Amino acid sequence: SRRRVVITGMGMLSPLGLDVPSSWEGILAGRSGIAPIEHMDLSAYSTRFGGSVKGFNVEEYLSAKEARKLDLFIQYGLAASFQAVRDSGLEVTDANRERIGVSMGSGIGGLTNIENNCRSLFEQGPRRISPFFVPGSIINMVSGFLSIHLGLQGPNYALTTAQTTGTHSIGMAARNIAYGEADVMVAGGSEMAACGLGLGGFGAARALSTRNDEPTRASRPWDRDRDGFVLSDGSGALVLEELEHARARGARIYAELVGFGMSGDAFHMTAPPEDGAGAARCMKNALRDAGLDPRQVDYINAHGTSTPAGDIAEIAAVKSVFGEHAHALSMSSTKSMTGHLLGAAGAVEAIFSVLALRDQVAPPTINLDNPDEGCDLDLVAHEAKPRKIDVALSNSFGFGGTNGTLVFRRFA
Amino acid sequence: SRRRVVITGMGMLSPLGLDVPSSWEGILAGRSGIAPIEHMDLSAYSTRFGGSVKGFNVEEYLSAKEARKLDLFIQYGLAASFQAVRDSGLEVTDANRERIGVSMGSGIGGLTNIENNCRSLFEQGPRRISPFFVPGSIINMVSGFLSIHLGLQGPNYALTTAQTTGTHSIGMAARNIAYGEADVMVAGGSEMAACGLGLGGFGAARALSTRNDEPTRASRPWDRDRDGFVLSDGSGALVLEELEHARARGARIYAELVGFGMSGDAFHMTAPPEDGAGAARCMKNALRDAGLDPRQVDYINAHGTSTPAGDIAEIAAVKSVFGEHAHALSMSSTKSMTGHLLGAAGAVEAIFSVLALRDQVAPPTINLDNPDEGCDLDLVAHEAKPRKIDVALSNSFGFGGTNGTLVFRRFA
Ligand SMILES: CC(=O)N1C[C@H](C)Oc2c(F)cccc21
Ligand SMILES: CC(=O)N1C[C@H](C)Oc2c(F)cccc21
Structure with a gap:
């Protein structure tokens, strides 16, 4: 078992x-x-x-x-x-x-x-x-x-x-x-x-x-x-x-x-769907797998690639999954600082998600000078934000419409 | 369960x-x-x-x-x-x-x-x-x-x-x-x-x-x-x-x-250990996973690449795992005919293993004109062998010492 x-x-x-x-x-x-x-x-x-x-x-x-x-x-x-x-x-x-x-x-x-x-x-x-x-x-x-x-x-x-x-x-x-x-x-x-x-x-x-x-x-x-x-x-x-x-x-x-969640978009070889439907299905799979209320999520390490379509699809997916709680969690892209490590991105970002839990701090999204239309969540613009984090989510999306979500929590 | x-x-x-x-x-x-x-x-x-x-x-x-x-x-x-x-x-x-x-x-x-x-x-x-x-x-x-x-x-x-x-x-x-x-x-x-x-x-x-x-x-x-x-x-x-x-x-x-079994040799980048210890662990893991005794195996689709060290390692592994049953099973390399499809090898060989079950026939190892030292198993030399097959294994033993075994059984 x-x-x-x-x-x-x-x-x-x-x-x-x-x-x-x-x-x-x-x-x-x-x-x-x-x-x-x-x-x-x-x-x-x-x-x-x-x-x-x-x-x-x-x-x-x-x-x-x-x-x-x-x-x-x-x-x-x-x-x-x-x-x-x-x-x-x-x-x-x-x-x-x-x-x-x-x-x-x-x-x-x-x-x-x-x-x-x-x-x-x-x-x-x-x-x-x-x-x-x-x-x-x-x-x-x-x-x-x-x-x-x-x-x-x-x-x-x-x-x-x-x-x-x-x-x-x-x-x-x-x-x-x-x-x-x-x-x-x-x-x-x-x-x-x-x-x-x-x-x-x-x-x-x-x-x-x-x-x-x-x-x-x-x-x-x-x-x-x-x-x-x-x-x-x-x-x-x-x-x-x-x-x-x-x-x-x-x-x-x-x-x-x-x-842990996976899902396929079944949408496009390279483009994410604008509504982030595959990313939403993937996070919901992961939160069910974890036996969680979505309101438990405190911090999301986004995929956050700095592509026009990718970034806005992720806002749409997080709003769809979390509803009003989307406005209470913190979500940041550490790719703002590291760039995109491609197949290594999900690995370094899982580590950053675990350290967010250890240190009770949401890493910043640097360079977020002028948030785009609809990008109105807490994206931890510019500066790290100390905060309570019991549950952290790390998301990744890739070519082929391939999605992954990891859910970490504090261990007592 | x-x-x-x-x-x-x-x-x-x-x-x-x-x-x-x-x-x-x-x-x-x-x-x-x-x-x-x-x-x-x-x-x-x-x-x-x-x-x-x-x-x-x-x-x-x-x-x-x-x-x-x-x-x-x-x-x-x-x-x-x-x-x-x-x-x-x-x-x-x-x-x-x-x-x-x-x-x-x-x-x-x-x-x-x-x-x-x-x-x-x-x-x-x-x-x-x-x-x-x-x-x-x-x-x-x-x-x-x-x-x-x-x-x-x-x-x-x-x-x-x-x-x-x-x-x-x-x-x-x-x-x-x-x-x-x-x-x-x-x-x-x-x-x-x-x-x-x-x-x-x-x-x-x-x-x-x-x-x-x-x-x-x-x-x-x-x-x-x-x-x-x-x-x-x-x-x-x-x-x-x-x-x-x-x-x-x-x-x-x-x-x-x-x-399904997996193992690692933890031995060498391209060569298996001479005794196929890792391949033996992998096959034992696959049988344990199926709740089957080695005596129940009728047919093995070998990895059988035609490399001197690989072929002799598989013979040792099979003798190790199957003991007094090692000569009763039939083992053949369809790579004798198809060559080595590398990452597709195990896919086509799983299909051949399923068809051996459907048709009750062991495919030949062609070109087996002079079996090498210790290669004295039933290697189905030259010609297909109609026989009873209830349980078929398919093995792959690849670079990095990474091993896989699949166990198929007749369904009715
Ligand atoms: C000694 C050395 O430079 N490092 C650095 C790294 C922080 O840890 C290591 C390791 F875990 C295994 C082997 C070497 C190192
Ligand atoms: C683990 C392995 O394959 N080694 C480690 C070994 C000590 O030296 C090597 C080498 F000289 C050239 C290429 C590879 C290796």
Whole structure:
């Protein structure tokens, strides 16, 4: 029968820091992690900035000879995963290794590596493709390499649900534990899509902000002057653990994962419906799953991408689900500061939602200078808001009409 | 307690055929789908052959306009999915659409689109990248497009576990139904990694057969002269359905899905442990999940990739799990005929496992001319074997050490 699931460990690389505390300090201070991209020449591109991980040292985690064969999305995913496992205090033994698994996802995975090998193929030939091309690039290898390094023999898989990946990964991992398929899961996501194909591809779709001359002000969810999302890199990982398992070993419990919702829009390959009907169905599924009155919700970490259609669909969904309570909860987009980490967005934002619960503070939506028509909720404009938070919701929506909602609450 | 899950619809593209019954006729006749790859200059490549889909007509499924937006692997995934839904007879309505979901996956995703867009980027610059590059290449777009086309509002997601993708997709969709998150799921996988990048990337690892002179004899699981796997393209999809839901509408039931197991080797990035310890744990987990004793298994559809280490690990795992029953079951690799469809392997092989139950026949392992040291099981060498089959397993053992096993049983 269905078991309870708590969060005992968290790990992060973000545009705001190389761990969780440094990232959360930036969040509460309203700091932007967005800047012109330094790692490649983008003069031919319509967008030349994003949220890079700054000063990442993979040799804090892995030998250079290994790191050299792994795409950055794997390196980031492993770094966050190692942080989360160390943060949990869990010791992997012969007695528990079959009961610990991993579900770390990505939207696009090792596009940098694939692009670089495609260049070798076209300019030189197939004789110059890296022997590590497949295991160093494909999405399931965060889960794979983490299991090899820590000895995890439980369920080993990866989700790829575009911008919903991190949320689905955590929710599905929580169901594994709930249903008895595992006692512990490391779950979240990682992304590094800032290569020519990624920036060029999102650029060709005209999905990105082109605020090149003022990158820190580009991501402005629900602001009338928003012009699309800001591409960002990094990783979030959480250690999810069955409650009695956590209690038995005296684990520090950050919060309880009480609800998970999924739904499909069945509307459009890339556009969200204006009424946010799929997002509403998803949140209602999650609140029913959590056994909650919707009035219990204190804080929503929105998807809040800074796209024209996405931001207004989320206001419409929150008003539909919460009615008059929509005006009492606080909702913010931390993508205002981090930008959009794509398949990692739901992972870092689950962590921010747990820290909102730990610290009793709603992170700000920076850059919300002029809220757009209908954007008249408490969106925590500009400055962090200390407040009572017993229940926090994290929402994600993605290409394919794919929706995910996580519901966290304080654990006594 | 848990609901029962049956198979009510199947769909396929393979190197043997453009649907299930054509592919299966090929399988029982011992026909190879392997041939030199056409319309590519593979001069510089060490492998020039594979399993292509022959004569695929996407306009049976999609408008020319929607087809131009989607990678081949997505086209193949949608063809299998549409076939499976038609085969099921299911009518989607306002009363059930929130209870019907999709989990169609891929191991490597859109390498053909990535190649073509790299060509544009490198030749002409980023402003020639296709506007539909990202949404037309990402792995969750089979689930995405299918949900939009058929109006499916249930759980919408995509797995990517390398060569285990199709097995995991089917198993996790079965869990969704068994635990009441959906009543119907479309599940499986699709792959198109011919392309220069697949043949080049697997070739760089020296993982492929290089038997260019005799492509149909290349894939020879457990044969002492095997020299690696054969890359193949296509798709498999099943309609999974809660039993009472199937009975109420008078569905034709092919078989029951009674067990699903997962494990991680936690061993190596691409090679299994010599004794297949992880594969043994996975099969034991799947049998425990079905409440079956190993003695009850009649037929195993092996992973059987034709890699020297993989094939011998499976023999050890099966001997380990089945003890004095290990010679009584029949185990065959249909990859001997189809080659290795990577993330679609487990999807087409689940279908072959269901059809073994329907038709009471073990498909052959073709090319098994000289079984290797210790390969002394009933590997159904050369010719199909009519036999009693009540319980059929399908195994996938993929990169990152990620394992899946499905257990099917006759339904009456
Ligand atoms: C875990 C793994 O696969 N390792 C770790 C091992 C210590 O070294 C490596 C290497 F040199 C090159 C590539 C990978 C690895
Ligand atoms: C030592 C080092 O730089 N770090 C930083 C990070 C906050 O935690 C770590 C970890 F959990 C596992 C391995 C390394 C590190």
